[PDB]
Amino acid sequence: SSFAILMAHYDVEDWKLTLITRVGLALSLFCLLLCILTFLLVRPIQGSRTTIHLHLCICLFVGSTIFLAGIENEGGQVGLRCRLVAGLLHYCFLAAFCWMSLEGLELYFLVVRVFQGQGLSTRWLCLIGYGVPLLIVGVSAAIYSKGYGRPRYCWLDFEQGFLWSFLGPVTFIILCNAVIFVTTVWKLTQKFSEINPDMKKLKKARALTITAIAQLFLLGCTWVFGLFIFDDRSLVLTYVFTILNCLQGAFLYLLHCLLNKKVREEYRKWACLV
Amino acid sequence: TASIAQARKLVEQLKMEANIDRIKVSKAAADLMAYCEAHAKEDPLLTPVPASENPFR
Amino acid sequence: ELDQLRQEAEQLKNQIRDARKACADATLSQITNNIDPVGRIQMRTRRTLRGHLAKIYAMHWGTDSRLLVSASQDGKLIIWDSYTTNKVHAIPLRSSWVMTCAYAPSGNYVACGGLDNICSIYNLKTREGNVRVSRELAGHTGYLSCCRFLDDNQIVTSSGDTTCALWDIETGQQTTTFTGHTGDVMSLSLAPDTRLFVSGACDASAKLWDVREGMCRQTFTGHESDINAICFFPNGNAFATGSDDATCRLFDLRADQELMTYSHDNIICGITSVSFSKSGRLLLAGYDDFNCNVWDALKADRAGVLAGHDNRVSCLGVTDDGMAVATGSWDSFLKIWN
Amino acid sequence: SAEDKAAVERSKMIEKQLQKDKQVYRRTLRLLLLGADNSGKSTIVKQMRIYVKTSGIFETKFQVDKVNFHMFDVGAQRDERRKWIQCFNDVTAIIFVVDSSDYNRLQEALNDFKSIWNNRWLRTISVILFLNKQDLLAEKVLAGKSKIEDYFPEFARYTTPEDATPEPGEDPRVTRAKYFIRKEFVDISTASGDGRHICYPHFTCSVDTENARRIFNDCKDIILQMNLREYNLV
Amino acid sequence: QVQLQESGGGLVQPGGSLRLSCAASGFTFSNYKMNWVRQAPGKGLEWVSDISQSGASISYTGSVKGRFTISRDNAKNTLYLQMNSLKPEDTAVYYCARCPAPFTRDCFDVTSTTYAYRGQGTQVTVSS
């Protein structure tokens, strides 16, 4: 039971990866619950971007819960429970990735097409976030219903290249965000000194790196390391993948909630009020 | 001669504003205090009302 | 020559000063040195009203203590019901820069004005159930600051061309013009018997006006900068003023001089609104540092603070029965306190 | 009941209309125009158009690349403006127009710009600066009958910056003069040292066509730099 | 009642010197900044010099640099201007101006429509 089974080709097993997975996922589940509460209840930060953050965190919570509960199978054959669990995990994680793509589009609206214009409502956001995964899962099941379920784990099979039904809709997304990201950072480097004349040359190259990492953990790019695990020769890449991507939620909470001033002020107000 | 007319108007106004009956400050202070004391039991913001007869609660 | 005129003016000013000094035999603090203080006054927020898009400039209550009206810098008037937080009317304007509002004492009409130098009068109760413009009054040569009703047929206005005016609505013509000020006119208040009124007009001076004769009775000085707000004491024998030197003052009409001063050494910003309470004991003020203050009107000691708004505060009102206080700010929110 | 339902229905209709109004209000850019009598802002207003008595304010509407601009000019008022200026603390831009072929009323324009910059309710509004009437300046300098140093002594020791980028075929004297004049405003614009608002200088004349595009670019920059501050992205 | 009163002036020959004094009453003097303005025959209202609260900021116009000096006394509540090396183009009526509000750094005080806080003026004529 390791987080690399999602994107591996050879059903790796090792006792010193499972401990990593469990510790990380417990801590991340806690932090993500805190995230959902904060985005729901603090009013002065409302907007579309917080809506996207909210729904991404919901998807990650549900998926991680199911994964911890039910990924391991007891040596038998394929049953109905295994099929259903595989389908559920597929759908939830595709939904997470679609929400990440919408985050990238929002960044494009903010930094390139600068002017305010006809945007997207909540309904049309929630139809793109949760519709494309349903269509993908349905078409996949119709074409080859047998793929779900594996002899030992409750996930996709290596036959027919069926696994690509997850790794195709993912790689594409990365090779759009990887463009926008570059663009964005360039713009920032041309406006930092215009807004903060007093920064030195060393304190300048710290805040900008923190901002870059903060956007790396929303625009899904840390997952790239998992596309090259087909070789048993590559183990350090698998360790990097697991360590980075079992702490998705902790880093989201630390870099988008505790580093925002308005949230901290509202926390102090709530604490002093009662 | 706009200035001449303006000065004449000012002089007439100041002349008109000098022949006025005036009273002492203590009388005015006493009158204000007496009024404040007369209606002190009907001021909701000074002696709050029970919550039963409050329109806002 | 002008020299004789200036000399006569100086002599008359000296006579006025001496005749005023001849009538001071006590200070109000001494006569009120044996009075029980109010103690501590605590108020809470019962309603929050949302729906505007930009800053608010004015509000005014009704004579039933239930309905109110607000004007904002996006071209909208809204009528609110304060018991249920409902809405009854929303009206869009031709011009967007509005600076005043009013509500007639019969519940039938409203009025507004602004940088277009025109006073607009709107009809509320119509056969078709719509709201339509019913009168436009034009003739001022500058921006219009405040306006108040006297009946369903007469109105009084003050503007930035240094004048005041009285208007008859059906004909649409002025009936009397009040002249004599030097700078802009910022506020006017009416006496409870609708026979006199007071104007405070932005050169450190205030004037008392007779509406039927059309002249000025007396003039009060003492401040240091522009005067922003003004209101009447309940019995029509005193009034209070606020200015941009961080000071409030209280004047009396029969002694013809200033009686009380309210100030502190930690307030260095101006005042935007002043109103009284029902019995006269409480004086309420709104300031530029985002909060409002509550003063005892006989001891000159501060007694309360209201701290709910995140931007400049500009509207403050108190009901006829005395149950609520309503505040409005530049963050586009109204609040009701009880 | 039987009345509360009608009240709630009215509230809901009003809310729907207010939402439709918000959508339009959030997507329109507002500009305030200032200048003096000898300035030529009337010509600028007329040349952006093809693209009642005792009234107080005038409005002009225009559109560039599917973006909507409102522009406000002030008419019948008095000359004391320390009170109505506060009505304009939430506009996108102030467009300040100055005449540059005068040599006599330049000090007043400088003092006006200084007073606009340092006010309290307008310390978050950027300014676009239009130095107008270039042709008259060129003619008056080349003719050689009036001296600039009579009104500004420091011109007697000024040298052109080594990074000058003049238009081809121009006498050096015109370039020296115009750059000195611009530096006079730029020095005032950078005494605060706060980084909260910016000045954009330009040159222009009475026969011109590209002023709408200039306003477009400057507004693009202003809105980008507000976006990168609202959403905590620096 | 705000009052400002001027003193000094008259007729002088070119190259001469003069001292203009201003006495103020009716307000607090330490919290306001002060201005010197003038008006010439046949022209409008001009602006000459300004001084801040304590004296950390002083500013002049171009035509007066190197000739005029400004000073302020808060204990005695007085404003001073010093004139040297006069020319036949300095004949005018002089006024003192106060800014409208305390604890600020902006001025709107060259207007003609009866600005409130300004004296009556003193006359200075240079000839021979």
Side-chain angles (χ1 to χ4, degrees):
Chain A
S1 293
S2 69
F3 209 63
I5 309 295
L6 293 173
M7 293 177 71
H9 295 104
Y10 74 117
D11 80 8
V12 65
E13 58 90 19
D14 180 18
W15 73 271
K16 64 183 181 293
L17 280 180
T18 300
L19 208 71
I20 291 171
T21 293
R22 277 145 199 251
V23 174
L25 269 184
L27 188 153
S28 291
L29 274 161
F30 186 37
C31 287
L32 280 169
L33 192 59
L34 269 179
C35 283
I36 303 174
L37 284 192
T38 292
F39 291 148
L40 261 180
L41 291 189
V42 183
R43 201 207 292 262
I45 64 179
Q46 288 322 108
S48 51
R49 184 176 177 87
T50 60
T51 304
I52 298 154
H53 296 179
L54 178 66
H55 286 288
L56 175 59
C57 289
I58 280 178
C59 280
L60 286 180
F61 187 102
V62 171
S64 296
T65 289
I66 291 185
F67 181 93
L68 266 183
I71 193 66
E72 204 163 0
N73 189 343
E74 294 294 328
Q77 300 300 109
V78 298
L80 199 73
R81 192 193 74 88
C82 197
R83 300 291 179 90
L84 281 175
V85 177
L88 283 190
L89 284 180
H90 192 172
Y91 175 83
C92 288
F93 278 112
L94 265 180
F97 267 93
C98 278
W99 282 102
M100 284 154 148
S101 170
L102 281 165
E103 186 70 29
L105 179 78
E106 173 81 13
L107 211 54
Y108 166 90
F109 284 169
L110 280 184
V111 187
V112 171
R113 183 179 63 83
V114 179
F115 292 120
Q116 183 75 224
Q118 181 67 41
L120 286 191
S121 65
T122 292
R123 165 165 31 195
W124 291 100
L125 276 172
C126 284
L127 191 58
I128 303 182
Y130 295 105
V132 190
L134 196 147
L135 188 153
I136 285 181
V137 172
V139 173
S140 179
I143 301 299
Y144 183 55
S145 296
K146 176 158 64 63
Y148 291 74
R150 188 184 294 173
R152 184 176 179 179
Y153 291 163
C154 277
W155 187 238
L156 275 74
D157 215 350
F158 313 121
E159 194 43 48
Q160 300 281 294
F162 193 53
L163 184 52
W164 285 108
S165 158
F166 182 68
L167 290 196
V170 165
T171 175
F172 181 86
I173 284 173
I174 291 162
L175 282 71
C176 300
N177 299 346
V179 164
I180 285 160
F181 186 62
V182 159
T183 294
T184 299
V185 174
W186 185 40
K187 294 289 184 72
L188 285 194
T189 58
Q190 298 184 313
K191 302 297 188 187
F192 193 86
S193 53
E194 193 71 27
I195 64 180
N196 281 349
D198 202 4
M199 295 296 172
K200 296 181 183 179
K201 182 63 69 177
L202 188 74
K203 300 289 94 175
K204 194 208 214 180
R206 168 180 91 85
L208 183 62
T209 67
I210 297 169
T211 288
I213 281 167
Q215 275 71 234
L216 264 183
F217 272 98
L218 269 47
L219 278 296
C221 286
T222 66
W223 292 64
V224 70
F225 293 116
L227 281 173
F228 305 120
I229 298 169
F230 63 91
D231 212 332
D232 175 15
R233 288 192 289 268
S234 301
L235 265 176
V236 290
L237 282 193
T238 306
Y239 276 91
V240 168
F241 181 79
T242 302
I243 297 159
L244 269 182
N245 290 318
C246 281
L247 300 177
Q248 185 72 42
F251 279 144
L252 293 206
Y253 183 69
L254 183 63
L255 293 174
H256 288 67
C257 285
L258 288 193
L259 285 195
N260 197 300
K261 293 182 183 293
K262 293 187 286 185
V263 180
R264 275 209 302 248
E265 288 176 358
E266 282 276 297
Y267 281 175
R268 272 190 282 272
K269 167 167 175 96
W270 281 356
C272 71
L273 272 166
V274 172
Chain B
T1 57
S3 65
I4 299 301
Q6 284 175 348
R8 177 177 60 210
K9 280 189 174 181
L10 192 60
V11 162
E12 284 175 352
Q13 186 63 34
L14 259 181
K15 277 180 178 175
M16 185 64 72
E17 289 180 10
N19 294 281
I20 291 174
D21 293 342
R22 298 177 175 80
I23 70 168
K24 301 286 191 168
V25 289
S26 62
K27 205 76 164 62
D31 274 27
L32 268 66
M33 208 178 330
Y35 186 98
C36 276
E37 186 67 27
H39 310 260
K41 294 187 289 293
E42 317 181 335
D43 197 347
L45 294 184
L46 201 47
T47 62
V49 292
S52 66
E53 300 178 20
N54 197 341
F56 279 81
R57 184 77 173 177
Chain C
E1 298 182 3
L2 193 62
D3 292 297
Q4 300 169 356
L5 305 154
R6 285 177 176 179
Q7 286 165 341
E8 273 196 357
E10 288 289 315
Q11 293 165 348
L12 264 59
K13 283 192 288 185
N14 271 330
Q15 170 185 341
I16 292 308
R17 183 178 294 172
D18 279 344
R20 266 165 173 169
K21 185 164 162 231
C23 296
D25 57 63
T27 61
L28 190 152
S29 63
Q30 295 166 330
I31 297 169
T32 65
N33 200 50
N34 56 333
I35 301 299
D36 291 331
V38 298
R40 187 83 189 175
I41 289 174
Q42 294 180 359
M43 318 206 193
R44 307 212 149 207
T45 313
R46 305 290 217 231
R47 265 72 178 170
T48 304
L49 310 154
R50 301 175 154 106
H52 273 312
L53 273 68
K55 48 187 177 179
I56 303 182
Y57 267 77
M59 57 99 74
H60 193 270
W61 282 95
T63 44
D64 62 345
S65 311
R66 191 160 164 173
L67 286 167
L68 63 87
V69 56
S70 296
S72 161
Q73 295 297 109
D74 46 324
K76 273 204 198 306
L77 287 193
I78 291 180
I79 304 190
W80 307 82
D81 193 349
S82 56
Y83 288 175
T84 79
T85 70
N86 275 338
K87 299 195 182 89
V88 186
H89 287 110
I91 313 179
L93 313 159
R94 293 181 184 271
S95 182
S96 309
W97 320 95
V98 56
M99 297 158 104
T100 184
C101 191
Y103 183 76
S106 56
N108 299 285
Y109 301 90
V110 298
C112 76
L115 281 178
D116 62 358
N117 306 357
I118 286 174
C119 193
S120 284
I121 299 165
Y122 289 75
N123 195 340
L124 277 179
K125 291 181 186 325
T126 52
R127 294 198 300 274
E128 74 269 18
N130 282 118
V131 298
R132 192 178 62 249
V133 185
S134 168
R135 186 49 47 151
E136 288 177 303
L137 290 165
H140 274 288
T141 74
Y143 61 103
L144 183 63
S145 307
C146 187
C147 61
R148 289 277 178 272
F149 265 102
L150 276 75
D151 63 358
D152 268 337
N153 195 164
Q154 328 199 61
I155 193 148
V156 167
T157 51
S158 75
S159 73
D161 62 343
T162 75
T163 57
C164 287
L166 173 73
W167 303 72
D168 187 2
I169 278 169
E170 293 104 10
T171 318
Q173 308 301 110
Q174 296 184 337
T175 310
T176 179
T177 61
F178 303 101
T179 186
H181 262 300
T182 299
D184 291 331
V185 191
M186 294 298 102
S187 296
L188 63 93
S189 185
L190 294 174
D193 45 0
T194 311
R195 296 291 185 269
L196 320 183
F197 76 97
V198 292
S199 70
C202 197
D203 55 0
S205 70
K207 291 192 180 294
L208 177 85
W209 296 98
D210 192 344
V211 62
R212 185 178 296 113
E213 296 290 314
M215 64 184 73
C216 186
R217 298 292 183 184
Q218 62 184 357
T219 301
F220 309 96
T221 66
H223 265 296
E224 269 169 0
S225 197
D226 314 328
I227 289 178
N228 289 332
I230 198 167
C231 69
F232 263 99
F233 201 71
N235 72 332
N237 279 312
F239 67 83
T241 54
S243 64
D244 291 331
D245 47 357
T247 294
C248 279
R249 298 215 211 281
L250 177 77
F251 293 103
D252 186 74
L253 263 69
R254 284 181 305 185
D256 199 31
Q257 43 193 342
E258 154 196 349
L259 279 189
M260 185 63 72
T261 187
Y262 320 90
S263 86
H264 208 258
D265 291 331
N266 296 115
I267 318 169
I268 62 170
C269 52
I271 297 89
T272 60
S273 303
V274 162
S275 178
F276 270 104
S277 174
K278 182 176 170 67
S279 66
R281 192 65 187 260
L282 289 201
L283 171 66
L284 282 86
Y287 286 75
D288 274 350
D289 51 349
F290 293 167
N291 57 332
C292 308
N293 269 301
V294 175
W295 307 77
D296 174 289
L298 297 175
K299 304 276 288 298
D301 291 331
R302 190 161 66 161
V305 166
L306 312 169
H309 280 295
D310 313 307
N311 212 331
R312 186 177 174 180
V313 176
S314 51
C315 312
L316 175 138
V318 178
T319 46
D320 268 352
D321 63 358
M323 302 264 162
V325 180
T327 50
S329 175
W330 274 5
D331 55 358
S332 68
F333 295 133
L334 280 156
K335 289 210 188 307
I336 310 291
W337 315 76
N338 189 359
Chain D
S1 288
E3 298 178 356
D4 303 334
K5 284 178 181 179
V8 160
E9 290 309 308
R10 290 186 69 89
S11 292
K12 279 160 177 230
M13 293 177 70
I14 293 179
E15 281 289 328
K16 289 291 289 183
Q17 185 62 255
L18 278 176
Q19 274 283 339
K20 294 181 176 67
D21 272 334
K22 184 177 180 180
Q23 295 298 109
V24 176
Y25 174 75
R26 206 165 31 96
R27 312 169 37 181
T28 305
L29 302 170
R30 292 165 301 265
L31 312 173
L32 167 74
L33 189 82
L34 271 71
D37 63 358
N38 53 47
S39 56
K41 59 182 170 78
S42 296
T43 61
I44 283 182
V45 168
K46 284 177 179 178
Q47 274 183 354
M48 294 183 286
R49 247 178 174 166
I50 312 175
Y51 205 79
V52 178
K53 293 180 180 177
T54 187
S55 66
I57 201 165
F58 305 131
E59 182 167 0
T60 305
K61 276 165 232 175
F62 61 109
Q63 172 171 105
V64 178
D65 291 331
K66 293 182 183 293
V67 192
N68 294 314
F69 298 86
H70 284 232
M71 195 173 312
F72 294 114
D73 185 336
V74 162
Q77 297 285 341
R78 281 181 57 223
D79 63 358
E80 309 198 44
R81 65 186 182 187
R82 68 183 182 263
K83 291 287 178 185
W84 52 268
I85 206 77
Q86 303 176 24
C87 286
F88 294 100
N89 64 7
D90 63 358
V91 287
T92 307
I94 291 183
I95 301 178
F96 202 83
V97 188
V98 171
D99 183 75
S100 62
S101 66
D102 196 80
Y103 293 170
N104 211 324
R105 310 256 301 276
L106 267 172
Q107 197 76 54
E108 299 171 354
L110 274 158
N111 288 338
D112 291 7
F113 189 58
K114 176 150 38 173
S115 179
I116 290 293
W117 202 244
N118 298 274
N119 195 356
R120 186 217 209 280
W121 312 105
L122 314 168
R123 67 184 68 188
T124 59
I125 309 297
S126 285
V127 178
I128 306 182
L129 193 69
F130 265 108
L131 303 160
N132 190 358
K133 307 263 188 72
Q134 278 302 299
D135 291 331
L136 285 146
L137 174 56
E139 293 292 327
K140 185 176 180 180
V141 167
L142 276 163
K145 296 171 186 176
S146 302
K147 317 293 193 290
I148 297 89
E149 69 275 16
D150 275 340
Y151 314 94
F152 300 85
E154 284 199 337
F155 186 68
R157 65 179 65 88
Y158 181 76
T159 63
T160 310
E162 72 266 23
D163 61 351
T165 63
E167 295 182 0
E170 202 161 9
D171 187 291
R173 293 163 281 177
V174 176
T175 308
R176 183 183 175 185
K178 53 160 71 179
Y179 275 78
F180 177 61
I181 290 176
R182 185 179 67 189
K183 172 184 171 267
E184 294 293 328
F185 292 89
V186 170
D187 291 331
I188 284 168
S189 66
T190 58
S192 88
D194 50 354
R196 292 183 291 113
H197 63 286
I198 301 299
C199 190
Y200 302 90
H202 294 263
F203 290 112
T204 188
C205 63
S206 60
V207 191
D208 267 327
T209 306
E210 306 300 304
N211 286 326
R213 195 63 64 169
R214 297 195 178 115
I215 301 183
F216 188 82
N217 298 332
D218 287 3
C219 289
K220 198 160 185 182
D221 202 327
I222 289 158
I223 296 169
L224 170 64
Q225 184 177 182
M226 293 177 70
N227 281 349
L228 265 51
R229 191 140 42 184
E230 182 65 26
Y231 284 89
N232 296 115
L233 210 58
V234 299
Chain E
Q1 189 80 60
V2 189
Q3 271 193 84
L4 304 158
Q5 195 63 54
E6 293 98 350
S7 66
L11 168 67
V12 73
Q13 78 270 25
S17 66
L18 278 180
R19 187 175 177 86
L20 301 184
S21 281
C22 179
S25 63
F27 64 100
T28 306
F29 209 69
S30 66
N31 310 348
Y32 294 78
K33 63 182 280 153
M34 295 299 291
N35 291 319
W36 272 107
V37 306
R38 83 180 173 197
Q39 156 162 27
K43 287 196 180 182
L45 291 153
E46 291 191 3
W47 178 94
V48 164
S49 162
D50 57 19
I51 183 162
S52 78
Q53 288 88 330
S54 57
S57 178
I58 297 169
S59 286
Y60 303 85
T61 199
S63 314
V64 302
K65 271 182 180 176
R67 293 152 71 207
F68 290 2
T69 301
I70 197 173
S71 304
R72 172 174 185 166
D73 206 331
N74 282 342
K76 299 197 289 289
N77 293 337
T78 315
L79 200 69
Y80 294 111
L81 186 77
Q82 167 81 43
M83 301 185 109
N84 280 328
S85 162
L86 287 145
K87 294 182 180 182
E89 291 90 1
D90 293 324
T91 62
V93 186
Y94 280 87
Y95 305 87
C96 57
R98 198 200 63 169
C99 292
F103 311 114
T104 59
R105 50 171 182 258
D106 55 355
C107 319
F108 286 72
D109 60 357
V110 69
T111 56
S112 78
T113 52
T114 317
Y115 184 61
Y117 315 121
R118 186 163 70 195
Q120 294 284 310
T122 177
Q123 167 91 50
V124 182
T125 300
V126 192
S127 75
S128 180

